[PDB]
Amino acid sequence: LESQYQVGPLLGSGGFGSVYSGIRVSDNLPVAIKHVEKDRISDWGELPNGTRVPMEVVLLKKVSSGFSGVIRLLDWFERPDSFVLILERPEPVQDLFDFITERGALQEELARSFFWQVLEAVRHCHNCGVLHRDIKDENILIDLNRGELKLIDFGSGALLKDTVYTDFDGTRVYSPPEWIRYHRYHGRSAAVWSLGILLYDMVCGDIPFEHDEEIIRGQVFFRQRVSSECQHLIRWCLALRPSDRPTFEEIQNHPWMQDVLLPQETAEIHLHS
Numbered sequence: 315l316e317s318q319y320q321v322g323p324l325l326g327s328g329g330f331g332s333v334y335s336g337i338r339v340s341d342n343l344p345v346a347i348k349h350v351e352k353d354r355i356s357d358w359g360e361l362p363n364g365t366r367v368p369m370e371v372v373l374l375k376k377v378s379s380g381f382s383g384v385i386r387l388l389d390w391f392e393r394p395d396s397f398v399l400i401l402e403r404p405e406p407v408q409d410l411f412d413f414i415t416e417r418g419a420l421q422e423e424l425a426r427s428f429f430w431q432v433l434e435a436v437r438h439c440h441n442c443g444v445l446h447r448d449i450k451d452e453n454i455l456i457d458l459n460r461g462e463l464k465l466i467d468f469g470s471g472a473l474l475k476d477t478v479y480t481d482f483d484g485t486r487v488y489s490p491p492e493w494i495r496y497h498r499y500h501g502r503s504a505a506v507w508s509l510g511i512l513l514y515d516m517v518c519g520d521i522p523f524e525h526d527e528e529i530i531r532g533q534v535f536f537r538q539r540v541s542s543e544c545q546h547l548i549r550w551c552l553a554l555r556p557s558d559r560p561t562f563e564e565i566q567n568h569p570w571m572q573d574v575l576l577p578q579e580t581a582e583i584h585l586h587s
């Protein structure tokens with residue numbers, strides 16, 4: 315049926331739908347229960363059969379196998395007017411947006427650990443043929459006990475492909491200049507641009523660009539003291555020409571990314587575990 319789950323408080327609502335705290339009754343596992351109205355759903359996909367479902371379900375199934383820094387889909391249900399997704403829920407948890415709101419710009423050692431884990435999660439998605447298309451601090455959860463980050467909300471995502479994309483429903487201030495100007499981008503280089511925005515966000519406490527004109531110009535001004543190596547990596551991710559941007563391999567081999575803390579180290583030093 316679907317009272318295999320006890321429903322708790324509303325955790326949040328927005329373009330992603332309505333998300334409730336929940337518990338799976340069979341083993342007390344913490345879950346998040348996400349309701350999405352069918353009419354409010356834009357991009358659709360389908361499973362290895364008829365079964366037309368939200369793209370989000372297709373993508374999560376493709377990445378939810380195995381361990382990773384991606385939130386796992388435990389189950390889903392269809393109702394007459396909506397879909398309901400059952401997702402794993404860290405506890406205690408705080409999204410990266412709220413974490414940055416409370417603590418301001420992050421020390422580089424902590425930003426390094428977080429950014430590294432985001433890179434590994436995004437690599438996993440791409441390796442599984444999934445492109446997220448809305449990487450940003452609001453879509454990243456922190457498991458405060460373990461110091462492990464989780465990517466959420468694949469509702470703007472798509473199957474990864476090597477040809478040009480001409481559709482985009484992600485967050486605009488995270489979208490690349492080629493999308494702003496031409497409404498065209500390729501998957502990896504757009505993702506790397508958003509990773510540059512995210513890294514700036516972490517070490518400066520706010521995003522670099524607010525307006526189309528700023529994104530198009532691509533001038534990065536640093537409002538906080540940031541190391542030259544970090545500045546260099548960020549400016550590389552934010553290269554105006556897509557082909558001038560680093561690959562994931564080049565990002566992880568960059569001098570700023572060396573000697574990352576383990577997740578548990580991160581929690582003990584910076585999240586006091």
Ligand SMILES: NC(=O)c1cc(Cl)c2c(Cl)c(C3CC3)n(CC3CCNCC3)c2n1
Binds near residue numbers: 330401404453466
């Ligand atoms: N797919 C989603 O949109 C989704 C998935 C999950 Cl597992 C969660 C969880 Cl947990 C939360 C609340 C713990 C913040 N939320 C609410 C969000 C947390 C980050 N942005 C603010 C509301 C979740 N949302």
